[PDB]
């Protein structure tokens, strides 16, 4: 069969087949060639000591690490035109990084399937003769206006919805999570790490996808199929195609609207958890709870991409007051506004064995406990000569990370003081065995002093008011607690 000058002529068919056998006879490592170990950087850690207005925190840095296994990309730019159903991209860093390189050469016609509800599955089927961003966008969205009439608005076709949340602890475990080129839109989220470091926020990032409508393509009989006989060997190889780097194809997109969400608190109240996962769902638990008490300390940037306009809003919209309104516009495709590529799914082109990527990290946890400050009251409207005996420690993390007490006293501990004297004193949150003492003289020479109060490990409250009163037989004493 072959040609008695012993080449093989571009644009026959014997140039197809030299292009289909070269692909098979490819071998490489699926698994190799995607996968990223990120940062190991897994060390030891110290307990810290520090001290915010307001309150006293205790910082326990833990060790984790994240690593998932998704075949599923998630796409960042508003209008990539390498990402079309059919695409071919090459297998890389390129491809690992959600920046893949197309292979535009001379491409073959595919034929797409798209998965809208009131569909004649004949009319579900498109030919595309030329595959590229500009005609297959071009199909659909012909397709999609015309479907746009004899159903979408005579009814309501809702968007699938698609929830996923993670507390922000490095912009690394975000990216293992949401995808490799996540610090775009990350950087747009003003994701202030400092502070979950330094246990001041606690940051939580939610993502919604929308998904209208999903446009896919079967799997390719040969390898070649999908190359015009113009393309040969030689061409696949001046553009770096080998065994070494092999080729995928897209085997499917789905469009509609995504949303990325950043849930900033000051509240270190453990329990943020649900007061997060409740506002998701609309609902409201009334004030004043301590979730009413949360969400006011709650700001909130969301980038939104999809149903619009081809771009992105990076919108602040400030408190948890616009969330219900994010996760509601565009909740129903009505096929006026096509919407854009959400998430993109790659199959090799040798054996259409779909590609997943196996992504990691280590990432440095932040738990954090909170020691409010407090403040303690002394009146005393006493008819009698008192003395206060006010103890405590300061609680500090040395350098090398221990438990240091570095006990403290009132200045006017052990001095006389009459009515009507009052005082009111700092605590800060990380004091430990609080202690007060009060004695009375009683005149009495029998009995000059006589305890009137005696107190060991106070509970560091927010509003502490000791009062003394009475006469020198007759003391009174209230301890009047205040939250």
Known sequence: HHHSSGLVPRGSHMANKAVNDFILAMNYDKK????????????????????????????ERKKRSLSTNTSDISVTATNDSRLYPGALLVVDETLLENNPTLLAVDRAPMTYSIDLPGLASSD??????????????????????????????????????????ITAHSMEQLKVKFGSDFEKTGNSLDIDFNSVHSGEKQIQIVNFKQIYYTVSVDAVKNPGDVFQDTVTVEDLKQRGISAERPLVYISSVAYGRQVYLKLE?????????AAFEALIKGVKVAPQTEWKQILDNTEVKAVILGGDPSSGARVVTGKVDMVEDLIQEGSRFTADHPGLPISYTTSFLRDNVVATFQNSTDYVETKVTAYRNGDLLLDHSGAYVAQYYITWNELSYDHQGKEVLTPKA????????????????????????????????????????????????????????????????????EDKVEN
């Open 32 to 59: 190799k060639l995607l996968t990223h170990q990120g940062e190991s950087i897994e060390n030891r850690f110290i307990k810290e000591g520090n001290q915010l207005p307001d309150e006293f925190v205790v910082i």
């Open 124 to 165: 579900s089927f498109l030919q595309v003769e030329d595959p590229s961003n500009s005609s297959v966008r071009g199909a659909v969205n012909d397709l999609l206006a015309k479907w746009h009439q004899d159903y979408g608005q005579v009814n309501n076709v809702p968007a699938r919805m698609q929830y996923e949340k």
């Open 265 to 273: 608190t000051t509240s270190k109240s453990d329990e943020v958890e």
């Open 410 to 477: 009132w200045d006017r501990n052990g001095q006389d003081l009459t009515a009507h004297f009052t005082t009111s004193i700092p605590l800060k949150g990380n004091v430990r065995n609080l202690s007060v003492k009060i004695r009375e003289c009683t005149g009495l020479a029998w009995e000059w002093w006589r305890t009137v109060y005696e107190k060991t490990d106070l509970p560091l409250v927010r509003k502490r008011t000791i009062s003394i009163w009475g006469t020198t037989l007759y003391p009174q004493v």
